[PDB]
Amino acid sequence: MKGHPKVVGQLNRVLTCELTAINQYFLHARMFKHWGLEKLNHVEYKKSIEDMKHADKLIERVLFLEGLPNLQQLEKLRIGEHAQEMLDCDLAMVQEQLTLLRDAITLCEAEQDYVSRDLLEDILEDEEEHLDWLESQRELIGLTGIQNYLQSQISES
Amino acid sequence: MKGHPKVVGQLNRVLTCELTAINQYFLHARMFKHWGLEKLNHVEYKKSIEDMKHADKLIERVLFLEGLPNLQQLEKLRIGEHAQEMLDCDLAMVQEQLTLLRDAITLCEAEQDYVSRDLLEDILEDEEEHLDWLESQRELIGLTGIQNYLQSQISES
Amino acid sequence: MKGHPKVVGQLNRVLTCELTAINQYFLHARMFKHWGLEKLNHVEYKKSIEDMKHADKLIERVLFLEGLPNLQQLEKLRIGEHAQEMLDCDLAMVQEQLTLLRDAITLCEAEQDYVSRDLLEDILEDEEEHLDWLESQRELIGLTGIQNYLQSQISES
Amino acid sequence: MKGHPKVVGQLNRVLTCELTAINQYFLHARMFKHWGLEKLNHVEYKKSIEDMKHADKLIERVLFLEGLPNLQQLEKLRIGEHAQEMLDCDLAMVQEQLTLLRDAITLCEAEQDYVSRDLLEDILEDEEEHLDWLESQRELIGLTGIQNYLQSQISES
Amino acid sequence: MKGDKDVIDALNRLLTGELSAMDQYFVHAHMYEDWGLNELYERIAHESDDEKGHAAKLVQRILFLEGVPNVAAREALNIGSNVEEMLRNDLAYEYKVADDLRKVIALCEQKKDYQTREILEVLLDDTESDHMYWLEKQLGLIDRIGLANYLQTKM
Amino acid sequence: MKGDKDVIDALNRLLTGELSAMDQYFVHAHMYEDWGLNELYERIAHESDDEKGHAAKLVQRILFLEGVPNVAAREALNIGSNVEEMLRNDLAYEYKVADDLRKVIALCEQKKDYQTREILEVLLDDTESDHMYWLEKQLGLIDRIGLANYLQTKM
Amino acid sequence: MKGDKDVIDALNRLLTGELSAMDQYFVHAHMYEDWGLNELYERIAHESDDEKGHAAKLVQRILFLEGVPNVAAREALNIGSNVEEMLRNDLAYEYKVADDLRKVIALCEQKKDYQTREILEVLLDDTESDHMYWLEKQLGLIDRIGLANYLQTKM
Ligand code: HEM
Ligand code: HEM
Ligand code: NA
Ligand code: NA
């Protein structure tokens, strides 16, 4: 089905941002593994796998809409040096990506692209569950301290 | 363990090339799925998963060697328009990446980095098994024709 | 719950079109079975079963909204003579029915009928997955030829 | 096998009537479900499934006989407002359809179309078992009253 | 995240509605059990549990949106005295909840708060396709078989 | 049976208490979940469910005694802002419920309503041996290991 | 077969290293157990067992190469007095073993003794990817959470 050019452009931009998220989440997961923080590894890895599924769905939607998926471009990665900075960078990226998703859902509704909108709404609920998790982690660092919080991440389960 | 700067640079370059391979293989797998060629989808997807594991191992090795994994850079993607062109682009990328791996193995041996060399040798055997598969596919297209070859890819198993 | 008259009219029109789709898909599935093309039989039959479920849901929604389901009217059936013509007729009907679904989703949103809209969005995603499949089949006929494509449909699995 | 034109015409007319029966039985089953009469739902739904199988067999027979199945035409639907009226409409349709089946069996015997006759005899035994069930329901309404009879249909099993 | 102020107010009104629904379904289920009508007791108790699930989802959403859930406020309960009256009160109250849910879904669409929109769409789907439909079926059955036959099936 | 009028009034006050407890434990459990403190969320949610069970028993007893359960009235909720405050509010409110339960058990003994006495004795046994004791243990643990260690165990 | 004389000498030095590692990991694991730090006890005991496996492989290779394994000689053990010191001594000694393994792998490559090369490459892969990495992670965790939090996780 020939999709709207604006919808394909928005999907390609959400795809760029999902790929940037995959890369940042995997680098952060492996930086966490390198420090022995295994539960943070596990969370960031499953989140990178999740954005992997999201990018897969966006590529398939851009292909179905007879567009050209743009896997070449990536955004700038925010790689932190320590756990708090990495969590803040992840938070900032989730927030930017949620703003982007909301703009794309608005445009998909304006163009009567309703299955693109359903796709983007699944991506939105997932990204906003991870936003919830990151805010929980920040509150936990504020509550128990960074040393106690990091001690809880040593064991993966 | 503090690794050699040359070995970390070579590992980062092999990592750039593994990430480029992941992106190209996934775009090609989903272009194949979009055309109903399901067995080609499956092969290109498992190959992208394999280069995914390779990039994971390279990131972990660069981190263990107290280097900075470079997930930001990607090489230029060769995306084909039809099956033969996509297979040729995959072939060209495997060949370039094998040359790179051989240079990196030589350097790792010259620096007595033997576990980096073992890592790169696993990546080499995998990449060169996929080279074998791509050459098999080209011979099969030459033997049965492109229409017969593509008909064999319709069903995934 | 007393539904909007416009929403019930749109649901009844989508129902007419879903019933026409059931009839056309079943006639085409049995024309395919008559020719020994068993995998095409299976696809067209499961698609007719799927539009059967869609018509069931539309009837239940029109009844819940205190409307009168119109199972009496059917649209004109496009019955092809050969496989390509039948697939093109199926494509044309899916495209018309998708346009209809999009108009109905727009109207359901304008009337704050949000569960009617959710129903129609499920029907839209299903119809547009079948649109994807039909476009895949057309690309496969263009790639492998009609004789090779039809040979792949002889065995159902 | 090239079938007799009269036999194919009779099979197409029995097919029109079987399709009309499918539609009427499904509308009635869902009207019963909408009223909470679940056992009546179940009976009318399995009867619509049964006429579905009958229409499938008639389509396959008309196709084997090198005829054109007519799924486009439907007869007028008798949709009742309440349970007794719906059961009477179902009764009237079964009786008309049984008369039609008997005429078609007579013609199939006159044309030495004996497998068409066996098909139509299976359809006849099924339709006349449902005639038996409908007459049983009318006798039960006369015996226990309509309020007691409808109370027995609330639970599906 | 920081939710829209109007979206949090509307979510809090929906929460008041769900909590009042819980109380009304609770007392009605137990009034049905006191009368030996165990099938209505079980159905209405499970609906009170579903209202508790909806209220949990709304409270979680209000807290995520950095609002203060209001579980103290309650709407006036309309308790029936006989089975038909309690079923009609439950239906009136489901109608009010569905209307208010539609208003808040429209508001969430205007305020770009899509995720609250799907939470409320799941709530509206339950309200319509789970218990408004059931109540309309029950009142239609009372109309068809009579109240004494209807109550006999509910024991 | 026809219950004593004072016993039904006291049962209705206990019902108001149990329903307010349910609301407070509900919002506190969800405030704990919003903060990532899943162990407190789960514990306090199960206690809200136990309050719902107690309220069900009280409503059943009031209806059996031919009274009218009052599920509309609610006491003022005391919602805390931080973990220690919410635990102390839950403890204060459990103390009040236990005191009021003891008064009503004494009343049921004077009014010869022995069966209401054992229903309320089971309620008092839960209130003391299930969650008042747990809250006192939690506050003592906060005193022993500190609040940051205590909250670390609750994730 | 008749192995190269230099390759057997280097294999015997690697054997002395592995045996000293075994002794040090043994006494350190038991010093961890004496202190109630059972997770460190178990980890360091399993590493002493892996050192025993490496020493077995080296002895088998030296005997196959028609050499005389030297299990009598031992390097000086560096026993720590507190957890950080024992972890740092284990890390220093893993570093020394990895350096010496690299020298012997280079020698086996020059002497065409490829099979000794892969035996030592498996040993080096264990030394790096099994316990040098683990020790660096442990020291980084001590740096991040502190020593008292780190030791609390090891009980
Ligand atoms: C830094 C780059 C990446 C790394 C290190 C990485 C790593 C991984 C790993 C380890 C897996 C699981 C493999 C398995 O256990 O079978 C995976 C799964 C997957 N990846 Fe990636 N990946 C990367 C980028 C991407 C990209 C860019 C895409 C698509 C555009 C992608 C698509 C997928 C898909 C579809 C899956 C399957 C989901 C699943 O595991 O269930 N990946 N990835
Ligand atoms: C030309 C008309 C139709 C034919 C020949 C037909 C045929 C069939 C057949 C053979 C089955 C599978 C039965 C079984 O194996 O148990 C089926 C299933 C079904 N049909 Fe139809 N059907 C027709 C129209 C309809 C219509 C108009 C509706 C609803 C408005 C409908 C609703 C259903 C449903 C709900 C199912 C169950 C889905 C399933 O099989 O899992 N059908 N149909
Ligand atoms: Na062929
Ligand atoms: Na601690």
Residue numbers in the entry:
A (entry chain U), B (entry chain V), C (entry chain N), D (entry chain M): 1 to 157
E (entry chain B), F (entry chain A), G (entry chain H): 1 to 155
Structure paper excerpt:
Iron‐storage bacterioferritins (Bfrs), existing in either homo‐ or hetero‐multimeric form, play a crucial role in iron homeostasis. Unlike single‐subunit bacterial Ftn, Bfr can exist as a homo‐ or hetero‐complex, which assembles from two distinct subunits in a 1:1 ratio. The interior of the four‐helix bundle contains a ferroxidase center (FC), which catalyzes oxidation of Fe2+ to Fe3+. Here, the cryo‐EM structure and functional characterization of a bacterial hetero‐Bfr (SoBfr12) are reported.
By solving a 2.6 Å‐resolution cryo‐EM structure of SoBfr12, we found that although SoBfr12 adopts a conserved spherical cage‐like dodecahedron, its pores for ion entry, ferroxidase centers, and heme binding and iron reduction sites are significantly different from those of homo‐Bfrs. Differing from homo‐Bfrs, in which the subunits are arranged with O symmetry, the SoBfr12 near‐spherical nanocage comprises 12 SoBfr1 and 12 SoBfr2 subunits that are arranged in a C2 symmetry. During assembly, 12 subunits of the same type first form 6 homodimers, in which two subunits are arranged in an antiparallel direction, and no heterodimers were observed. Six heme‐free homodimers and six heme‐binding homodimers then assemble into a hetero‐Bfr nanocage in a fixed pattern. The most significant difference between SoBfr12 and homo‐Bfrs lies in that there is no heme bound at the interface of two SoBfr1 subunits because of the lack of the conserved heme binding residue (Met52), and as a result, SoBfr1 and SoBfr2 are unlikely to function equivalently. However, because all these pores are formed by two different homodimers in various combinations, the pores of the same type are not necessarily the same, resulting in 9 distinct subtypes: 4, 3, and 2 subtypes for B‐, 4‐fold, and 3‐fold pores, respectively. Remarkably, the interior surfaces of B‐pores, especially subtype I (3:0), are rich in negatively charged residues, and this feature likely facilitates the uptake of positively charged Fe2+ ions. Analysis of the surface electrostatic potential and hydrophobicity revealed that the subtype I 4‐fold pore formed by SoBfr1 only has a highly negative and hydrophilic pathway between the FC to the pore, along which Fe2+ ions move. Given that Glu94 plays a critical role in stabilizing two iron atoms, its substitution implies that the FCs of SoBfr2 may largely lose the ability to oxidize iron, and therefore SoBfr1 is primarily responsible for iron oxidation. All data from the cryo‐EM structure determination and biochemical and physiological analyses converge to support that hetero‐Bfrs are fundamentally different from homo‐Bfrs in structural details, including highly diverse pores, functionally differentiated FCs, and heme‐binding sites, which amount to substructures specialized for oxidation, mineralization, and reduction of iron ions.
